[PDB]
Amino acid sequence: KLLITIHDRKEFAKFEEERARAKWDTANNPLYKEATSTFTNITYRGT
Numbered sequence: 001k002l003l004i005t006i007h008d009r010k011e012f013a014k015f016e017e018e019r020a021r022a023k024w025d026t027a028n029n030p031l032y033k034e035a036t037s038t039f040t041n042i043t044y045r046g047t
Helices: 002-019 031-040
Strands: none
C-alpha cells in the first residue's frame, strides 16, 4: 500500500488543486461540491 498509495495519491495530490480541501475540509465551501460539478459545469448549459 506504501507505494501503491504514493504512486496513486499522485492523482489526489493532483486533483488537490480543485478540492485540496479534502485534507482540511473536503466539504467547507460548496467549491468542494463544485470541483465535481466541473463535470456537469460543461453540460450545465442545459443545451
